[PDB]
Write an enzyme that holds these catalytic residues in place. Structure first.
Site, PDB file in Angstrom:
ATOM      1  N   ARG A  56       0.844  -1.225   0.000  1.00  0.00           N
ATOM      2  CA  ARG A  56       0.000   0.000   0.000  1.00  0.00           C
ATOM      3  C   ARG A  56       0.876   1.272   0.000  1.00  0.00           C
ATOM      4  O   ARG A  56       0.503   2.207  -0.659  1.00  0.00           O
ATOM      5  CB  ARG A  56      -1.018  -0.134   1.139  1.00  0.00           C
ATOM      6  CG  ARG A  56      -2.179  -1.047   0.742  1.00  0.00           C
ATOM      7  CD  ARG A  56      -3.023  -1.550   1.907  1.00  0.00           C
ATOM      8  NE  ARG A  56      -2.307  -2.384   2.880  1.00  0.00           N
ATOM      9  CZ  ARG A  56      -2.906  -3.236   3.728  1.00  0.00           C
ATOM     10  NH1 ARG A  56      -4.221  -3.409   3.701  1.00  0.00           N
ATOM     11  NH2 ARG A  56      -2.191  -3.940   4.587  1.00  0.00           N
ATOM     12  N   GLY A  64       3.497   1.793  -1.711  1.00  0.00           N
ATOM     13  CA  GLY A  64       4.281   1.806  -2.954  1.00  0.00           C
ATOM     14  C   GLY A  64       5.323   0.681  -2.994  1.00  0.00           C
ATOM     15  O   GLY A  64       4.934  -0.492  -2.821  1.00  0.00           O
ATOM     16  N   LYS A  94      12.161   4.617  -1.522  1.00  0.00           N
ATOM     17  CA  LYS A  94      10.725   4.404  -1.567  1.00  0.00           C
ATOM     18  C   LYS A  94      10.204   5.093  -2.816  1.00  0.00           C
ATOM     19  O   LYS A  94      10.478   6.299  -2.974  1.00  0.00           O
ATOM     20  CB  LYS A  94      10.060   4.935  -0.312  1.00  0.00           C
ATOM     21  CG  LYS A  94       8.554   4.751  -0.265  1.00  0.00           C
ATOM     22  CD  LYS A  94       8.005   5.222   1.034  1.00  0.00           C
ATOM     23  CE  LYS A  94       6.501   5.247   1.073  1.00  0.00           C
ATOM     24  NZ  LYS A  94       6.093   5.641   2.460  1.00  0.00           N
ATOM     25  N   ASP A 134       0.197   7.863  11.546  1.00  0.00           N
ATOM     26  CA  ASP A 134       0.060   6.496  10.973  1.00  0.00           C
ATOM     27  C   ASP A 134       1.110   5.522  11.543  1.00  0.00           C
ATOM     28  O   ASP A 134       1.677   4.722  10.782  1.00  0.00           O
ATOM     29  CB  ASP A 134       0.138   6.536   9.448  1.00  0.00           C
ATOM     30  CG  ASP A 134      -0.413   5.274   8.775  1.00  0.00           C
ATOM     31  OD1 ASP A 134      -1.091   4.489   9.443  1.00  0.00           O
ATOM     32  OD2 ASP A 134      -0.225   5.148   7.564  1.00  0.00           O
TER      33      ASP A 134
HETATM   34  C1  LIG Z   1      12.443 -10.875   5.473  1.00  0.00           C
HETATM   35  N1  LIG Z   1      12.757  -9.500   5.093  1.00  0.00           N
HETATM   36  C2  LIG Z   1      13.708  -8.865   5.796  1.00  0.00           C
HETATM   37  C3  LIG Z   1      14.024  -7.572   5.414  1.00  0.00           C
HETATM   38  N2  LIG Z   1      13.477  -6.960   4.244  1.00  0.00           N
HETATM   39  C4  LIG Z   1      13.907  -5.608   4.072  1.00  0.00           C
HETATM   40  C5  LIG Z   1      15.251  -5.324   4.218  1.00  0.00           C
HETATM   41  C6  LIG Z   1      15.705  -4.014   4.214  1.00  0.00           C
HETATM   42  C7  LIG Z   1      14.842  -2.940   4.084  1.00  0.00           C
HETATM   43  N3  LIG Z   1      15.365  -1.677   4.132  1.00  0.00           N
HETATM   44  C8  LIG Z   1      14.753  -0.472   4.431  1.00  0.00           C
HETATM   45  N4  LIG Z   1      15.554   0.553   4.884  1.00  0.00           N
HETATM   46  C9  LIG Z   1      14.985   1.760   5.111  1.00  0.00           C
HETATM   47  C10 LIG Z   1      13.609   1.963   4.947  1.00  0.00           C
HETATM   48  C11 LIG Z   1      12.849   0.910   4.509  1.00  0.00           C
HETATM   49  C12 LIG Z   1      11.335   1.040   4.364  1.00  0.00           C
HETATM   50  C13 LIG Z   1      10.565   2.243   4.120  1.00  0.00           C
HETATM   51  C14 LIG Z   1      10.977   3.507   3.731  1.00  0.00           C
HETATM   52  C15 LIG Z   1      12.031   3.711   2.804  1.00  0.00           C
HETATM   53  C16 LIG Z   1      12.391   4.981   2.311  1.00  0.00           C
HETATM   54  C17 LIG Z   1      11.708   6.096   2.779  1.00  0.00           C
HETATM   55  N5  LIG Z   1      10.683   5.941   3.674  1.00  0.00           N
HETATM   56  C18 LIG Z   1      10.314   4.709   4.126  1.00  0.00           C
HETATM   57  N6  LIG Z   1       9.267   1.946   4.059  1.00  0.00           N
HETATM   58  N7  LIG Z   1       9.163   0.670   4.363  1.00  0.00           N
HETATM   59  C19 LIG Z   1      10.388   0.089   4.586  1.00  0.00           C
HETATM   60  C20 LIG Z   1      10.427  -1.389   4.945  1.00  0.00           C
HETATM   61  O1  LIG Z   1       9.249  -1.941   5.323  1.00  0.00           O
HETATM   62  C21 LIG Z   1       8.164  -1.615   4.451  1.00  0.00           C
HETATM   63  C22 LIG Z   1       7.890  -0.097   4.500  1.00  0.00           C
HETATM   64  N8  LIG Z   1      13.409  -0.342   4.267  1.00  0.00           N
HETATM   65  C23 LIG Z   1      13.474  -3.252   3.933  1.00  0.00           C
HETATM   66  C24 LIG Z   1      12.998  -4.515   3.981  1.00  0.00           C
HETATM   67  C25 LIG Z   1      12.498  -7.587   3.577  1.00  0.00           C
HETATM   68  C26 LIG Z   1      12.144  -8.892   3.969  1.00  0.00           C
END
Ligand SMILES: CN1CCN(c2ccc(Nc3nccc(-c4c(-c5cccnc5)nn5c4COCC5)n3)cc2)CC1
Length: 294
Positions: free
Chosen positions: A16, A18, A33, A131
């Site tokens: 949701r 993005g 993102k 949120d």
């Molecule tokens: C089993 N896994 C483990 C980890 N995963 C994973 C690994 C690294 C990241 N990195 C990351 N770093 C910074 C921000 C975010 C991020 C952000 C984000 C990024 C940039 C700007 N604002 C928010 N939104 N979201 C996330 C992750 O979760 C969903 C929502 N993710 C992620 C997943 C996916 C599945």
């Protein structure tokens, strides 16, 4: 821009919000993102907050840049990359010990009290998130967390006494909505209303985390708040019946009462969930209580 010196390498999630990619910024890992085309307002609001305020803290996601690029137009928000991913994902990967549980919830409390407090500095307006949930909190390598996703944030300044609510048609994640949001009774012209909505959400997150802390050989499976009474992607009406009509709160597992840490955390999360928003604890009171708990 940073986007023109950035290559997407791999998609680490879609939903949701993005998409989130691991990107290379001149070789260095960053999170990118990519906003939904329907969610320009969230990109504009987060970009506005990160660029105009001193929003820089151990427990808030570190901003690098915002960018527009062709691929149609895509709106990017570039941040620190946290390889452990979201608290939601992490709580499914592992159980927690006492030190790990407390480090996670204290760090969230510290970020949230940093958003909520005006600094005159250096400084920053007071900010309510609107949120908060386990899916927009990241886990850092040191076991602390950081809060992300400021696209619904509301700002207050005591100098001007003006509330800045922005202009975003997005509403909170329905599962985490405070009763006053769901029955449309929230006082939309008082900044304190928004902070109180964050405290309700924080309470649910404390519950989600505490279930995963082992005590006396027992731990609960990961479940989202209200897993037992609403379906996946619950409707505004599904939630309204549970929280406003039935006045239900997440259940405290009996086994918590055989652990001093989970007993204190059960006490804390119930004072996040008062139906009367004025009776909820503040982010700063929560931070102080969690600093003392062992
Ligand atoms: C089993 N896994 C483990 C980890 N995963 C994973 C690994 C690294 C990241 N990195 C990351 N770093 C910074 C921000 C975010 C991020 C952000 C984000 C990024 C940039 C700007 N604002 C928010 N939104 N979201 C996330 C992750 O979760 C969903 C929502 N993710 C992620 C997943 C996916 C599945």
């Amino acid at each position: 821009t940073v986007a023109h010196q950035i290559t997407l390498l791999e998609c680490v999630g879609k939903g949701r919000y993005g998409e989130v990619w691991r990107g290379s910024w001149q070789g260095e890992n960053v999170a990118v993102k990519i906003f939904s085309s329907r969610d320009e307002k969230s990109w504009f609001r987060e970009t506005e907050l990160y660029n105009t305020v001193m929003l820089r803290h151990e427990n808030i996601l570190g901003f690098i840049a915002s960018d527009m690029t062709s691929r149609s137009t895509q709106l990017w928000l570039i941040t620190h990359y946290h390889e452990m991913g979201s608290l939601y994902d992490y709580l499914q990967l592992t159980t927690l010990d006492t030190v790990s549980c407390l480090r996670i919830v204290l760090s969230i409390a510290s970020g949230l009290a940093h958003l909520h407090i005006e600094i005159f500095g250096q400084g920053k307006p007071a900010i309510a998130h609107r949120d908060l949930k386990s899916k927009n909190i990241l886990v850092k390598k040191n076991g602390q967390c950081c809060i992300a996703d400021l696209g619904l944030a509301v700002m207050h300044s005591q100098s001007t006494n003006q509330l800045d609510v922005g202009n975003n048609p997005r509403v909170g994640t329905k599962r985490y909505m405070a009763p006053e949001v769901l029955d449309e009774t929230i006082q939309v012209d008082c900044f304190d209303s928004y902070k109180r909505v964050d405290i309700w959400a924080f309470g649910l997150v404390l519950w989600e985390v505490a279930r995963r802390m082992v005590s006396n050989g027992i731990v609960e499976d990961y479940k989202p708040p209200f897993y037992d009474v609403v379906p996946n992607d619950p409707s505004f009406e599904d939630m309204r019946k549970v929280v406003c009509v039935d006045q239900q709160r997440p259940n405290i597992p009996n086994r918590w009462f055989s652990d001093p840490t989970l007993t204190s955390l059960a006490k804390l999360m119930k004072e996040c969930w008062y139906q009367n928003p004025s009776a909820r604890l503040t982010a700063l009171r929560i931070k102080k209580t969690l600093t003392k708990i062992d």
